[PDB]
Structures are given as structure tokens and as C-alpha cells.
Amino acid sequence: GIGTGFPFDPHYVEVLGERMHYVDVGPRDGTPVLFLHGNPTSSYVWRNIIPHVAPTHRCIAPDLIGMGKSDKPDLGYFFDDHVRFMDAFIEALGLEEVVLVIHDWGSALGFHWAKRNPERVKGIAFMEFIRPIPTWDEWPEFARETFQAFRTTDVGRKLIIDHNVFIEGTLPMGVVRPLTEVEMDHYREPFLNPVDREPLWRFPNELPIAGEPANIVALVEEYMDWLHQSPVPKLLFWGTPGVLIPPAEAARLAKSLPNCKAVDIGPGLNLLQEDNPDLIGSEIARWLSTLEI
Ligand SMILES: [Cl-]
């Protein structure tokens, strides 16, 4: 079965006065592979993909500030807060050229960082990523009224902060196969205290949906304009029905994005890592062997 353990030794680096945790495995030399998770996950979401890559490539998988085993400073945990901390994490580790493997809000971080530093990005593997959602009709019907309620300070915060709905309900509803109790407890562990759940609510409130919020929309539009032009090698994974990326959108992108190979992982919602980690991991490793890295 799909692995439920997290056997990686912890590593910590001081970033802007805060401790960030990260996985670091594989060989020391060579170009590293940087895995960025999203909401409401951690490096745990990469636990079954990394072992396919670590035999031949360094794997670095940080927990976003306020998440995983990283410190939990009193921040609003806006997308800009994560930008600041990931910028500084990358520089605190002395990384120069990287390959990015990115998902959900980690894709927004990685795409925004690659757009600003394209000479340092030798390839991007991405899946279920942040794109402008033009209208709410383009958000999955089965999740629409809930994500709309998420984006309020009254009902949204009762659900996410007080009742932990993003972990207890949204997370399983983003995975086609059933999550075991051991996996749920891994995803629950950073957020046992309700006050620590601010990131889980601020993230859906930053999602670029129907032109809101306007700053995030413009930021994501900018890196999508870069991605439609850039020659950077691209690997897109997609599932059916998907959540952020339905199969029709994955189809368009495979055709339009330059140097982009698309891989159908089968059934999948948002956490595609949890539905087909062996295909995702084995395809990242094969794709990497084709890169000039
Ligand atoms: Cl979100």
C-alpha cells in the first residue's frame, strides 16, 4: 500500500528569525530538487514521491512557515508572508540552480520565484496548481459554496479555525482514495491548537477567484504569462476530475505551455500525491534524467 510513514531526519534553518523545518535527502552534489507543498499539507505530502528521486538527486522539501514542523510566528500568513519566508529559505540554504516540484500554494510560490529568477530554474514539475479562476463556475460545484464561505471572517473562520474543517473535511475531500487514520494524524499534528490555524484560513482567502483578491490575481497572471512564454522544461501532472486543474484545462496547458510534458495520473482531486505517488515520483525521476542539470 501507499506509505504512511515519514522517515526523514529533521533539518532546520533559521529564516528571518524563525525556524523552518525541511527534508534534505539524496546526493550532495548536483542540482537539487525543491518540493513545495500547499494548503493544508506539509512535506508529508511528498513522502512517497521523494524516494523515487532521492536515489539520483538531492531532495529538499520545506514546511512553509506556520506549517509542518516549522515555527509559527504571529503573522497574517498572506501569500506575501510565504513569499518572504521562501525567498529567504532558498538563500539560507545557499541554493543556486534548482529544479522545482510544486503543488497548490507551493506552485504559486515556485512559479512566482521562477518568474523572478528564471536563470536559476532548470525545470518545473507541477500539479493542481494556482491559476486565476475566472468565475466561481470554474470552481468545482461540489466544493463551491464551502470555499465561498471560507472567504469570510465570520463563517469562514468558524469552519477553518474553530472547527478545523480544512483538515477534517477539505483535505480528505481533496483525495479520491480514503486516507488512513495514521495519515490524518500526520496532517493534523501541526494544527492541534486552533490559534495555529491562521494559514489554513488565509490561504483560501488568497485564492485568485473571480478577480478577488485583485493583488493575487495580478501576481498569478504575471507568472502565468511568463510560463506561457518561457522555454523552461515543464512537467504537468493532472487527474480526473481534479480541483484547481480540470482535465480540459490540463489539456490546453499541455498544448500551449512550451517544452511541457503532461502526465495523466488517473483519478485525482487536489492532493494528487496521495492518489498516485508512484507514477508521480517515477515520472519526475525519468524527466529529470532528460534535463541538462
Ligand atoms: Cl487554499
Side-chain angles (χ1 to χ4, degrees):
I2 292 173
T4 58
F6 187 80
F8 308 106
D9 303 344
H11 305 268
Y12 297 104
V13 65
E14 190 85 345
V15 176
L16 303 177
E18 309 291 335
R19 204 188 63 188
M20 288 185 53
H21 167 262
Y22 65 103
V23 181
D24 190 358
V25 294
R28 295 297 87 190
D29 61 353
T31 299
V33 186
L34 180 64
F35 297 74
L36 308 184
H37 74 83
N39 192 35
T41 64
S42 74
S43 49
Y44 186 74
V45 76
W46 303 118
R47 73 193 176 284
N48 296 319
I49 289 165
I50 284 178
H52 290 266
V53 176
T56 55
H57 292 92
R58 189 179 177 186
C59 298
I60 305 171
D63 301 332
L64 298 185
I65 195 65
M67 311 188 76
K69 301 180 190 179
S70 293
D71 284 3
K72 301 175 180 303
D74 196 9
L75 304 178
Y77 289 100
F78 289 88
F79 178 70
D80 185 74
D81 287 326
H82 291 297
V83 175
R84 291 181 309 107
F85 274 85
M86 192 48 64
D87 280 3
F89 175 89
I90 297 177
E91 301 308 317
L93 267 71
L95 316 182
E96 317 219 289
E97 330 191 330
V98 300
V99 178
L100 293 175
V101 182
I102 57 183
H103 175 232
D104 186 75
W105 280 105
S107 64
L109 285 173
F111 284 143
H112 187 55
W113 189 86
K115 187 209 58 178
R116 290 177 291 151
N117 308 270
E119 323 188 328
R120 291 168 68 182
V121 174
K122 302 318 183 177
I124 297 177
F126 50 101
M127 67 210 73
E128 271 293 306
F129 67 89
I130 307 293
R131 54 163 192 127
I133 305 289
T135 71
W136 277 104
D137 291 4
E138 285 89 76
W139 190 265
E141 179 162 7
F142 81 104
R144 179 176 311 148
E145 290 181 20
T146 299
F147 271 82
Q148 294 175 336
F150 278 179
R151 298 160 63 85
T152 57
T153 61
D154 52 358
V155 178
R157 296 184 66 79
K158 278 169 200 135
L159 296 165
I160 296 189
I161 282 81
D162 301 340
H163 299 158
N164 210 18
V165 164
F166 220 105
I167 293 297
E168 294 297 337
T170 306
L171 160 75
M173 285 177 76
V175 179
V176 167
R177 59 109 176 154
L179 296 167
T180 72
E181 189 67 11
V182 161
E183 302 175 306
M184 288 302 293
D185 288 336
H186 275 277
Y187 283 118
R188 296 163 164 147
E189 183 66 354
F191 303 111
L192 295 175
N193 191 344
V195 304
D196 297 333
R197 298 169 189 161
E198 195 71 28
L200 309 189
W201 174 88
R202 184 45 76 171
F203 266 141
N205 277 270
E206 298 274 68
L207 288 163
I209 301 168
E212 293 194 71
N215 48 319
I216 301 310
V217 174
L219 181 158
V220 170
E221 284 176 341
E222 288 168 358
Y223 70 54
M224 293 306 301
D225 187 43
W226 171 77
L227 203 76
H228 279 89
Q229 319 270 276
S230 173
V232 62
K234 300 172 194 59
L235 185 62
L236 173 60
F237 298 93
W238 62 276
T240 297
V243 167
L244 299 181
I245 308 298
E249 175 79 18
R252 271 178 299 255
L253 290 162
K255 296 168 266 203
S256 65
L257 298 182
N259 306 322
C260 179
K261 182 182 185 329
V263 177
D264 186 355
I265 71 140
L269 284 154
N270 181 253
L271 282 76
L272 307 188
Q273 307 95 318
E274 300 289 13
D275 274 312
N276 197 351
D278 293 308
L279 182 71
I280 295 170
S282 71
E283 281 289 339
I284 290 170
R286 181 212 52 80
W287 169 76
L288 293 167
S289 68
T290 74
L291 303 187
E292 292 198 312
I293 67 187

